[PDB]
Task: structure prediction
Amino acid sequence: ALKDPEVCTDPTQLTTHAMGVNIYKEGQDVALKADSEYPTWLFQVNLGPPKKLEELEPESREYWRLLRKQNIWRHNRLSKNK
Amino acid sequence: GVIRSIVRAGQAIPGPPLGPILGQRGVSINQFCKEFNEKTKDIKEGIPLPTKIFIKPDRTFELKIGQPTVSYFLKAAAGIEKGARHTGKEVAGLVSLKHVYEIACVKAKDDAFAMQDVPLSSVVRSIIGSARSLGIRVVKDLSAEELEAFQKERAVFLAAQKEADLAAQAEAAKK
Amino acid sequence: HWRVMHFQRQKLMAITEYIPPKPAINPRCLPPPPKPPKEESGLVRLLRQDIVAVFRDNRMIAVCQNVALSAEDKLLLRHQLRKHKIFIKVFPSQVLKPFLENSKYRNLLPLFVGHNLLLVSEEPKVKEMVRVLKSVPFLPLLGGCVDDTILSRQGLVDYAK
Amino acid sequence: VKLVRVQFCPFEKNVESTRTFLQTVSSEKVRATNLNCSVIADVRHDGSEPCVDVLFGDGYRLIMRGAHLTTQEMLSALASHIRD
Amino acid sequence: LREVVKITVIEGRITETPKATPDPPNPSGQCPICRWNLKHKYTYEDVLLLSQFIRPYGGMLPRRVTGLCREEHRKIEECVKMAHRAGLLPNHRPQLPEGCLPKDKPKLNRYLTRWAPKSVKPIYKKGHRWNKVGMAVGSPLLKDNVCYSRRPLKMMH
Amino acid sequence: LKTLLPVPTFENVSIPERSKLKFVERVPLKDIRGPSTEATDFTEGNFAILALGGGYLHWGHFEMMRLTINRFMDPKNMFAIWRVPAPFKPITIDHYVTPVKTGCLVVEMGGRCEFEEVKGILNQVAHKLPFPAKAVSRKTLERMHQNQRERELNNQNPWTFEHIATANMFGIRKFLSPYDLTQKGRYWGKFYMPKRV
Amino acid sequence: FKTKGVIKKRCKDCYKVKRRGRWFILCKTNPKHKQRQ
RNA sequence: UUAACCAUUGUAGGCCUAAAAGCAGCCACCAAUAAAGAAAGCGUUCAAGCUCAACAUAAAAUCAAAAUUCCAUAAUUUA
RNA sequence: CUCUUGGAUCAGGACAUCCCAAUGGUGUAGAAGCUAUUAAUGGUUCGUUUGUUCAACGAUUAAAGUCCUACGUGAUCUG
Ligand code: FES
Ligand SMILES: [Mg+2]
Ligand SMILES: [Mg+2]
Ligand SMILES: [Mg+2]
Ligand SMILES: [Zn+2]
Result:
């Protein structure tokens, strides 16, 4: 029942280290490497909502993959009432 | 036979939920919890750990365990107390983009099979859904002073929430 | 209860009833009008490009019938093949036929019957491919082509050495 | 059913029922269902019609050729023979 | 025609089958009946046509093998029953498994029997002049057949 | 190759604030005879119930409709409206009734839903009405009218009810009512004939 | 064998037959579901 | 619009609810994979378990013609 | 605001069956029961009024069925 409350107090440490990363009691908390030391694509992740069917290209898997989910959504909607 | 549980290392004996059913299949129930407890000593504890215990006609104990749940792991990273009931407008933890990258550098390595989860987008989007599933709003970046301003609002908001529950609880007791 | 109609009025209704005209020939038994050409949705064209790239890029293509292995047991084979950097490819049979009709490989159509899977790589690690096959005895191999040469299972085993 | 033996030749265009029947025989639920059976698959390159052989420890041997028998008949005969 | 032979070892041998007479009078007809211009000109009495779609034990063949369209399949199926009930197919009787023998009762002559004789109730109370209960004769499915009479056929007797 | 296609979208639908059906108060012969002149077309929603007979709806009928629809409908995605007046005609006063004519829409539903979802419940409610009715939609309702026009144009009968009645051939008007000239034989008492042309 | 005006299938296993001049819905798993017209 | 075959996972999504895990709710509802809804149903004290939809593989193609004792006889095709 | 029925004798008939008979389902272990389908075969008792607006009580029975037939039936009898 002892869910851990909010932890840490230092914004700089939170942005330059992370205490919660460590998963071994013996293991120490890891520290963050330089920004340039990580790949560019890591920082280029999509931080917004997923692209909608209108935005996605009709010739892309993502456009059709969402369309497949929507069709399943429609089937469940119809199947619910029977 | 694969059996999956999220029991926490801190508490090793649920009891009737697990021991009898496994005993009905046929297992060393006393060994099972103690075997879980000695594993708890070896590694961290107090956190819900998924397990993949295998039960066969041979009746062989094969516990499989590893790194803990993502939500609790993210809660420490974002300083999240816990989930809130509403989860619609509830905001607890806001964390930096860089912090998200570093936390998951080794967390995704806990995959039971060596899943080629090279895109971290798969994990952050799952955490976005997880946080929203919890009483959490995940913003791109939060300022510490902004957190303090909200925390003052949250304390007032939480106090009003308790009063609303108390009024309903008192009314229910009268009924 | 419907109030009865004077017999004279009843006679009027019987004579003025609707009569439909009937065609000389029933449409179904007639030859069908030509169907409008179907439009290729953005699945075959995108899928078409993928199959062209995998056949051209990968020198060796091994065709094996799908044995419907369990997901838990399916993962290890992918991981074993992933350790060998060998990929598994599956495509709908319908879209596979047109390329095999007009391509460098055209005699593999009899093999391409039923459920099938394709083993594709960029290196001729055939011994590892056969070794990963030995993990599952029941699963057979139908053969295919290695290094742009068409051969069956019996030849592949000797080719591994 | 103590043992089950299936053989066929892929590249020759001939009976396909056997290959589908092999798939049904080589099914994880089926192999568990008749656990006693040993599943064996051996592909051949000669000009030989596919032959299915079922072997019993009691000495009864059931040989089945897909040459003109459909997959349905394969299972139907197999089921009745297992009963005996 | 494929026959399965059991010699235990069993095998099936394919044999030759006679082919349809060449030169259909009306090519481009999708169903075999249309090809020969027989749409509305066959009845239960036409055993020669009907027998061609019958198994050696009197059963109907599946549509996929025959290739008939839905409308003609239902008509042929219904006409076969009446031909059986009218004693017009003596060599297509049911198979007696081990010791069963024909019931050996007297045979009542019939024709144009819509329903199974077993499960029809008697008409104990017939009606008065224009409230009479009718006794069905023939099948509704064959209504549209060509008629050589001044007025349409009387289905209810 | 299962062929997937774009799914229909309800991005044009807007849900009213008051989704549920409001309560009808218990308290405030040619009326049911002949064709309906009111509420004959779709107003707001895409689905409704269409009467095929003339009948009186008392208060008890209203509650049966209200409770059934309110119990099933989802306020978030569904809405319903009343398309008929409340009971106003006094019957000896013991109770009040709302007259209904053939072709009148009784209740109309809408929202982000398709007809197939609501067919079963609407048909069930229709069966319980005191007059014969069937659930219809915008497309189905238009098709019936289109079918009626087709039947008149292609009819092969040289003789029709309208010509004979208006021209008094046979002196047929001796045996007819004034209304026959208007209705043209499509209405008899309170009953509507669906195939009379 | 409840005799009802409309016979309706009540479970997946229910099936329909035409015996002795009437329509039946028969379910082996649940004999409760047996009906006649 | 269908009859054939199937089912891996982030994690048991938060929430006084012990727990309420796709399924009491309650808001969110995202994730990987070719292909899988924080689930259209059952079912579990909660869990388990059964299904649906997905994976490849197939095929077909609206309303209508009761009380004395049965009561003409019969009949489907000739212009 | 109001204002023809009983009984005796002899019974003809319907099935919407009370008992006897053949069956399906069950929250049917056996024994008892509750419900539904089919069928008109013969049967279906004896005494009594302190209170009870077209009621009740005693003793029994395998059962003490519901109805139609100008109160079935007074040129057969009777209150
Ligand atoms: S007879 Fe030709 S399709 Fe019907
Ligand atoms: Mg009598
Ligand atoms: Mg009865
Ligand atoms: Mg007298
Ligand atoms: Zn059932």
Notes: Helices of chain C lie at 7-15, 44-57, 71-83, 93-101, 126-135, 153-160. DSSP finds six helices and five strands in chain C. The longest strand of chain C covers residues 60-65. Chain C touches chain D through 21 residues (CB under 8 Å).
